[PDB]
Amino acid sequence: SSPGIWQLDCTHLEGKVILVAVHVASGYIEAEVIPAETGQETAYFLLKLAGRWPVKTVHTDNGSNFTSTTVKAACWWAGIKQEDGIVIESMNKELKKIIGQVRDQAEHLKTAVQMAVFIHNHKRKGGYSAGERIVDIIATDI
Amino acid sequence: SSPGIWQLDCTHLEGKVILVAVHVASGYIEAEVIPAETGQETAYFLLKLAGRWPVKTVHTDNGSNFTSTTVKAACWWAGIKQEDGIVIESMNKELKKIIGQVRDQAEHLKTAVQMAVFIHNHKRKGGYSAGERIVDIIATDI
Numbered sequence: 001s002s003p004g005i006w007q008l009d010c011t012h013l014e015g016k017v018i019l020v021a022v023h024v025a026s027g028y029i030e031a032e033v034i035p036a037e038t039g040q041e042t043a044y045f046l047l048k049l050a051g052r053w054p055v056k057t058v059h060t061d062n063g064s065n066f067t068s069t070t071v072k073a074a075c076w077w078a079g080i081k082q083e084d085g086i087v088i089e090s091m092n093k094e095l096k097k098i099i100g101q102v103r104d105q106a107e108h109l110k111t112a113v114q115m116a117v118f119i120h121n122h123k124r125k126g127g128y129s130a131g132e133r134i135v136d137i138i139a140t141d142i
Numbered sequence: 143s144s145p146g147i148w149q150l151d152c153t154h155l156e157g158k159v160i161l162v163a164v165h166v167a168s169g170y171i172e173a174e175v176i177p178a179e180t181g182q183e184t185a186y187f188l189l190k191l192a193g194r195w196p197v198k199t200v201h202t203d204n205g206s207n208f209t210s211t212t213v214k215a216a217c218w219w220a221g222i223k224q225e226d227g228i229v230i231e232s233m234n235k236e237l238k239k240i241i242g243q244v245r246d247q248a249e250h251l252k253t254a255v256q257m258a259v260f261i262h263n264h265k266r267k268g269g270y271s272a273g274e275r276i277v278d279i280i281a282t283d284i
């Protein structure tokens with residue numbers, strides 16, 4: 001169901017990889033800079049996300065990355081269901097748009113990515129932000 | 143007020159440092175393994191936390207770590223108020239207790255810490271978990 005569904009995606013910037021988790025119903029995001037797209041990086045990120053938010057189902061833009069036994073262990077341990085198939089381009093475009101706008105304010109790319117995550121989750125779209133929508137969606141399900 | 147108050151603390155294990163953020167009203171935690179307690183590590187962690195949860199006020203067990211101009215920049219950029227003074231020993235004892243219980247299941251300490259964060263936030267105390275309490279507290283304030 002809708003409150004526990006997340007989409008994982010990866011995007012490239014400055015010879016680095018940005019791993020993004022999107023809470024599908026709200027548009028709320030978590031993101032991190034990693035050296036390369038690997039099973040180990042995805043597994044560790046999933047384990048972190050699942051301890052912080054209710055993660056019931058995960059989708060990816062890269063099915064081969066979910067085949068990894070390290071990713072399988074993270075989903076098995078956290079009780080996450082892997083679901084095939086999957087917007088993503090637009091989220092990656094909007095995130096890179098925010099990143100480019102703030103890039104000069106920081107030395108490290110990871111700092112600019114976290115500033116971009118902050119801007120995205122706090123942005124009101126009398127409208128609500130993605131941060132307000134995720135908390136609203138999950139509290140309703142409790 | 144109560145929904146935006148966080149406590150930061152650091153604890154040592156296996157020659158490494160575990161940086162813990164506790165949502166005071168719920169007992170919900172975020173934690174990471176870092177090489178050493180620095181202004182830069184604390185600043186980056188604060189920037190991440192504030193983009194993910196409403197962080198209005200932060201307290202620490204180590205005031206000298208909040209004096210750093212890098213920590214000051216993170217709080218200024220994210221609009222966090224630093225508040226002097228501050229339970230913590232018991233949270234560190236409970237977290238290390240959970241860590242020791244799972245330590246053998248993983249090679250890396252960081253993996254065991256994330257498993258411990260997952261266990262703590264999901265643990266029901268008909269009672270509610272820290273994960274349910276934080277979402278409940280924040281949705282009420284919306």
Ligand SMILES: Cc1nc2c(c(-c3cc(F)c4c(c3C)CCCO4)c1[C@H](OC(C)(C)C)C(=O)O)CN(C[C@H]1C[C@H]1c1ccccc1)CC2
Nearest residue numbers: 040043044047069070072073074076077247248249250253
């Ligand atoms: C370094 C490492 N290598 C492997 C594995 C894990 C790993 C990954 C996880 F996501 C995880 C756990 C472990 C131990 C313990 C339970 C919580 O989740 C780790 C882990 O480090 C990461 C990648 C940085 C997180 C660590 O520190 O040990 C997991 N292995 C799975 C095959 C045993 C088989 C398996 C077991 C269960 C389900 C599916 C496959 C492959 C190698």
Ligand SMILES: Cc1nc2c(c(-c3cc(F)c4c(c3C)CCCO4)c1[C@H](OC(C)(C)C)C(=O)O)CN(C[C@H]1C[C@H]1c1ccccc1)CC2
Nearest residue numbers: 105106107108111182185186189211212214215216218219
């Ligand atoms: C490497 C680095 N060194 C310094 C600083 C920041 C830094 C830290 C932040 F928390 C931060 C920002 C920056 C640029 C931009 C806005 C969002 O928050 C970074 C940052 O890397 C981290 C530590 C890994 C996050 C980066 O990549 O640039 C911040 N500097 C502050 C004195 C200018 C003065 C200041 C400015 C505003 C308020 C208070 C003090 C000292 C050196």
